[PDB]
Design a protein around this nucleic acid. Structure first.
Ligand SMILES: [Mg+2]
Ligand SMILES: [Mg+2]
Ligand SMILES: [Zn+2]
Ligand SMILES: [Zn+2]
Lengths: 589, 589
DNA sequence: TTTTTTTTTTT
């Protein structure tokens, strides 16, 4: 019953952070600068500053938030009077609630309590409007009266029309007045539980969440998010009894987090090492022995090149990798690692995917009856990585649907009266087997690969893996047994900080090409084309795409070291890795 | 008539177990300590204690369960006052009801009586909430009153709204208040009669069951269960009568069991025998003569290896077996035995299965038009064994769908805008025929097997069965005729005991590899690779998967004897069995 | 009719 409003202001005005800079007065300082009407607090900070204040938010969230928000609004107005007439209400969001419940473990006892759920966002609906205070007109020739229907209370989830006119006490028919109605932004989304917590032999469960006001459009499908709010039962058709007094539960979102300054200097410290490139390469798939050239190639695809956007056209900045090898060469294990270390990645297989599922699918809503598009794997992976294992198992009639997405990075649809064009700027990493399961050295490369030259030319690098039992078997056997015995390689960058390093590099680093790098690349390309003319039977063609592959690879190498320009050293590395690619496919220079 | 609360409390505090250790008091504090809020009792024990009490439970169940629930709650409160305010109700569940009725024999006379049904779980719905006590607000400008609608009575299965406001006596509008409404967990499941119970020439029947409160998520689809509760008629759509006074029936589950200390003593006693491994192998398919190496191989697949989960990757721990042989070599009979003895197994046929049905199917829900996922055979067999007979009859373009699930133990779907990943950690035992029905010795092994090298490398062991007539025919004929004569081989572990032994071993034994075993395994693998390179024509490739097969087989042998370490003896057995596999496919060692 | 995944008969 004690007044907590005064506790809030002294908390906000007076608080010391880890950096000792009064972190919580700059956020409100920027609150009026951009008029975002939303302030973020941490439960750990509120607990340390006042244990009693923290508890009251947890258990009395229903009837403490409007008072707490109202107190903050008065303080903001005192700081700057111009905030008036721009924002009517200011929301404060609480994160870090210790009450974390798994999606499958929610029971009846959790209804009406503030909880947190971690999951995957799978579906988002367009932003709509919800009525919380309506205005009606009594259509009865004596009344012609206006009145806000829900008195001293907001409109519930179910819309209800008055039966007795409050202005005359008589029944009749009432007409809604949209211009005098108060609205609020409304959005619906579906959260799916992570695959880690799914029990054996069961399908993942889903939960419906509601985003309102400024929380709309705060995430995209495929993101991993943490949502905090209040559970409630969902009402859809209360008018129809139809027996079955059984309801589904939904969650009203109060705050959402999508999966800091100390990381920046940690990343900067790593980039200062002259051998950072070797450290990153050694940190790719530590459980796999050997395959150094493959690990280097996979590292480049994670960073990628610099996309170019011009007045008349744009140039792809992503790097595509194709691996062909004998079974058991650990191709799939490295692809699994890539899908975990990448900040955004989608893992698909050749057999378990279709053309519609990879790019875009036309789905007809049975209720309304109209067609609309559904995002495929490549569209959802925009700005990230797409992994396509067992690419050779795809039907050739179905695999050609990704030809334009791999180069033009767009998906074109002309179906069921829908014409659209969606961006699919995603790097593609694929693996497969030769025509006869294992590579046959007694036959030409033409019949071993069994892939059209059109798709081969779209891959920046192609590595052919051969399982040759030699003198390294003992070393390979010892390494594998050490892994099975729990022994772990040391002096490597762990996956968590490695993911942060890649995300930072792809966002703030844009290398530039210098004059000396141009000459090295130009000379090498001429030799590549000249050497290719010697053997025209090979299904590997040296097209102008190969020249742009060198530019992208060179930029990727500089991006690993966080350099702002491409020097001759980065150009030399790009030539070296390209040379190994050519030797694998049988082109020797 | 009389009150049994004193007897019930006395029975719990005075009953004696098998060792007269009062097997019921130590369950009470376990209920208090974990707040499990559900206690079970045995009907045999109650009958053995007081016959009159058992009859009252078995007959007057609907008027004695609340009475015993209240008596139990009071005894808990005095034992521990902290139990209050956390659990407001504790249910007691009675099992072992003598009233057992087949699913097909249920008639109107059994309605309203406590019965028990044994069947197979097929469908489970997500957990929902059911209202048992509602709260309404009369929307009439004079009332603004809140009240609990169902007075001194639980809310029926049909949602009924008040017609006359009790607080004012007038009709009008009533608004539900979710905050004051009381809810209870609710789940719906479907149970099917056992295949051995279905009459000739008819499809199996199904029954709908309801699980509430703590009984939700008590089992997974495909389980074998025994459900006890009260039968009742189902009221689903009472809005319009439409004549048709005919109703279905459904079961309100009171206690459910799936498929102990005395068993543990029996299991541990078996492991003391030095020849337990030989004794176990002799118990595999006792009705099949010969095929000792096959029975040994099948025994290993039942136990499996030790899966390894690391911070960056995971390693398969399951063992896959492939059998190729001439027709009439008892391949199908042995596979049928594995289905019976395995704690969890799924039997499929190559011709009677599809790619979608084996892994996962995307189907369009008719009511809404939205696509959703259906679990395949491999997903349902997670943590168990998947049996695929006539694998050679599968279409090659369709058989490749299981390549991912056999090594990475995952199922990936990218179809119709659905991207998902599912766990399929199951062991695969497959059988089939050579290319020409019977094995042809003139032709090489490559054209006889007629399988791609990719699928072959996935199998830990491959055995080729040749039906060669010889001097052993007389022994085989005598053995078969004795089986038809009713004679049974003795000194073999019965199937029920063997199933318990395997389940215990797979749950509590995690063998570790010693230094001595590492040296033996490494030497053999190096030797295998050298021999393979000498004859680069066989369809079997010695990939690094073969090295991991040796580790998995070694752990299985140790796990068979409930050993915590892999000594050198287990390594020699693993090497020896692999030698027989290599000689079967014509690879000399 | 229309796109989609699926098992099925029949174009
Ligand atoms: Mg693979
Ligand atoms: Mg057979
Ligand atoms: Zn009026
Ligand atoms: Zn009233």
């Amino acid at each position: 019953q004690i007044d907590y409003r005064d506790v809030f202001i002294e908390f906000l005005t007076t608080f010391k952070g880890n950096n000792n800079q009064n972190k919580y007065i700059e956020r409100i300082n920027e609150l009026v600068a951009y008029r975002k009407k939303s302030l973020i607090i941490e439960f750990s900070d509120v607990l340390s500053f006042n244990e009693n204040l923290a508890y009251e938010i947890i258990n009395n969230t229903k009837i403490i938030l409007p008072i707490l928000e109202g107190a903050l609004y008065d303080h903001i107005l005192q700081l700057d009077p111009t905030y008036q007439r721009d924002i009517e209400k200011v929301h404060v969001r609480i994160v870090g609630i210790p009450r974390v419940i798994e999606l499958r473990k929610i029971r009846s006892t959790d209804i009406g309590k503030l909880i947190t759920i971690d999951g995957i966002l799978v579906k988002v609906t367009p932003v709509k409007e919800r009525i919380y205070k309506a205005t009606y007109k009594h259509i009865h020739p004596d009344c012609m009266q206006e009145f806000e229907w829900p008195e001293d209370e907001e409109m519930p989830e179910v819309l209800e029309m008055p039966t007795i006119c409050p202005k005359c006490g008589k029944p009749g028919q009432f007409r809604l007045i949209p211009e005098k109605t108060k609205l609020i932004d409304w959005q619906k989304a579906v959260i799916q539980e992570r695959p880690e917590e799914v029990p054996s032999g069961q399908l993942p469960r889903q939960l419906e969440i509601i985003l309102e006001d400024d929380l709309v459009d705060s995430a995209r499908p495929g993101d991993r998010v943490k949502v905090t709010g209040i559970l409630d039962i969902k009402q859809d058709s209360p008018v129809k009894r139809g027996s079955r007094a059984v309801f589904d539960i939904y969650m009203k979102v109060s705050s959402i987090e999508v999966s800091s300054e100390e990381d920046e200097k940690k990343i900067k410290d790593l980039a200062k090492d002259p051998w950072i490139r070797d450290r990153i390469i050694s940190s790719i798939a530590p459980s796999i022995y050997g395959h150094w050239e493959l690990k280097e190639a996979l590292a480049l695809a994670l960073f990628g090149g610099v996309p170019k956007v011009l007045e008349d056209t744009r140039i792809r900045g992503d790097i595509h990798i194709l691996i062909i090898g004998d079974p058991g060469t650990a191709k799939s294990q490295m692809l699994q690692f890539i899908s975990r270390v990448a900040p955004r990645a989608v893992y698909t297989t050749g057999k378990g995917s279709t053309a519609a599922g990879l790019t875009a699918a036309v789905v007809r809503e049975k209720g309304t009856g109209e067609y609309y598009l559904e995002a495929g794997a490549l569209v959802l992976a925009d700005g990230g990585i797409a992994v396509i294992d067992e690419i050779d198992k795809m039907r050739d009639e179905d695999r050609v649907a990704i030809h334009e997405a791999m180069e033009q990075q767009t998906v074109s649809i002309a179906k069921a009266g829908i014409v659209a064009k969606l961006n699919a700027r995603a790097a593609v990493i694929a693996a497969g087997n030769p025509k006869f399961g294992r590579y046959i050295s007694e036959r030409p490369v033409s019949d071993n690969i069994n892939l059209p030259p059109t798709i081969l030319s779209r891959f920046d690098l192609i590595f052919i893996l051969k399982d040759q039992p030699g003198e390294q078997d003992r070393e390979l056997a010892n390494y594998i047994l050490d892994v099975h015995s729990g022994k772990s390689t040391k002096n490597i960058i762990d996956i968590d900080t490695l993911r942060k390093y890649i995300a930072y590099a792809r966002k703030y680093v844009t290398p530039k090409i210098t004059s000396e790098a141009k000459n090295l690349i130009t000379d090498f390309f001429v030799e590549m084309r000249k050497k290719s003319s010697e053997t025209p039977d090979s299904p590997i063609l040296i097209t102008p795409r190969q020249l742009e592959a060198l530019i992208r690879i060179s930029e990727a190498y500089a991006k690993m070291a966080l350099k702002a320009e491409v020097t001759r050293e980065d150009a030399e590395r790009a030539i070296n890795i390209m040379r190994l690619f050519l030797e694998s496919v049988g082109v020797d220079m």
